[PDB]
């Protein structure tokens, strides 16, 4: 199984992937919200980062993600992941297992400046936020 550093919000474990962080969104009611936070901290990376969502993914991750802010995430918070991490060689991958939608990217090498980004998994009335922080060396 490929190891995905990220958040699995579905009820099923993938036959292909294992996720570092998991919260079944079917286990919470409509008044609930999920916050799932991942922190990568290495001098150089060789990591698969991604999301397993049984609903809709906002925005078009991981081609585009949200830049985090002390305000409610809005269309003008959409950025290109390329520009957010500021490395040119990001490979993107997508998969589907039932109504679970899997989006991934691969990051290899160092990051010039510590950065974070958010992607949303919306299942009907419930929402789950995945926020990844990636450290620069030091």
């Amino acid at each position, epitope marked *: 199984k490929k190891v995905i550093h990220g*958040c699995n919000f579905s009820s099923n474990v993938s036959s292909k992937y294992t996720f570092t*962080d*998991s*919260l*079944d969104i079917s*286990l*919470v*009611d*409509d*008044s*609930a*919200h*999920i*916050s*799932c*936070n991942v922190h990568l901290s290495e001098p150089k990376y060789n990591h698969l980062v991604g999301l397993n969502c049984p609903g809709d993914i906002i925005p078009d991750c991981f081609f585009q993600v949200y830049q985090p802010e*002390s*305000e*409610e995430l809005e269309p003008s918070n959409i950025v290109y992941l390329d520009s957010q991490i500021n490395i040119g060689d990001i490979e993107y991958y997508e998969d589907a297992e039932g109504d679970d939608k899997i989006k991934l990217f691969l990051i290899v090498g160092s990051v010039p400046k510590t950065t974070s980004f958010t992607c949303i998994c919306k299942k009907d*009335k419930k929402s789950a936020y995945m926020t990844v922080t990636i450290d620069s060396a030091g």
Partner: antibody, heavy 127, light 108 residues
Framework: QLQLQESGPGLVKPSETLSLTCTVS??????????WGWIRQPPGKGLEWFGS???????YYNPSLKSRVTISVDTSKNQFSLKLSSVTAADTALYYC???????????????????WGQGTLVTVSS | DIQMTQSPATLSASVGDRVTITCRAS??????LAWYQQKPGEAPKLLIY???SLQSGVPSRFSGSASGTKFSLTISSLQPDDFATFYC?????????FGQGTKLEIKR
């Protein structure tokens, strides 16, 4: 059909420990990603959050209670408990148990308002 | 701690009136604000979550809105059984903190 039901004595003497238990039915604490907390309402006043417990036994307390609050969980009885030490007349209040979420800043956490409440139990601090 | 300033402390209005209760937070709570209605002899009942979503079964005359740090609860036309104390609460972070409460009085 989740239901929360408080139990515990209505009378406690000053400087003693107030003890209450909340019994959950219609669902299992050990399978839940929620938090199990206590909120109180002194007679004629507002609501104050005392603390919460996750099903692992991790606890979270209001620092304004100055460590007077201890919370425990017993997943084999589907119960969780509140202990408030050295009570005064100021602790005469209605005590609620409730299901709610965690705190922004936790790594993987449900963020949710108190939705299922107990009916409330009145504890009077008096000699 | 995040402090919640709820206004007004008491509210007097007649049946069919539009009433608005506001709550302001001392810092960002995102939209994690709940509104509770506490009728006499009852626990507080969750009406609105995420500042503007109605709990299942809540009448349509109830609505919530936000503005960054300023949150509103509006009853579009008051009814007699709306009599209660209303409380806001941030559930963004621990410790949970509640507004001071608004006691609603019905004129007749």
């Amino acid at each position: 059909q989740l239901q929360l039901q408080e139990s515990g004595p209505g009378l406690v003497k000053p400087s003693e420990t107030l003890s209450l238990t909340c019994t959950v039915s219609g669902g299992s604490i050990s399978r839940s990603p929620y938090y199990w907390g206590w909120i109180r309402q002194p007679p004629g006043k507002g609501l104050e959050w005392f603390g919460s417990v996750y099903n692992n036994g991790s606890t979270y307390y209001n620092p304004s209670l100055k460590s007077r609050v201890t919370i425990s969980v017993d997943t084999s009885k589907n119960q969780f408990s509140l202990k408030l030490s050295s009570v005064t007349a100021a602790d005469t209040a209605l005590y609620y148990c409730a299901r709610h979420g965690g705190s922004t800043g936790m790594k993987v956490v449900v963020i949710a308002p108190p939705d299922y409440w107990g009916q409330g139990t009145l504890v009077t601090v008096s000699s | 701690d995040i402090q919640m300033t709820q206004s007004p402390a008491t509210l007097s209005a007649s049946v069919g009136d539009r009433v608005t209760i506001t709550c302001r937070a001392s810092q960002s709570i995102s939209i994690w604000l709940a509104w509770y209605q506490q009728k006499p002899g009852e626990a507080p009942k969750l009406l609105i979550y995420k500042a503007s979503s109605l709990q299942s079964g809540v009448p349509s005359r109830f609505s919530g809105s936000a503005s960054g740090t300023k949150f509103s609860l509006t009853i579009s036309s008051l009814q007699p059984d709306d009599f209660a104390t209303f409380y806001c609460q941030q559930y963004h972070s621990y410790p949970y903190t509640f507004g001071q409460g608004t006691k609603l009085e019905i004129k007749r």
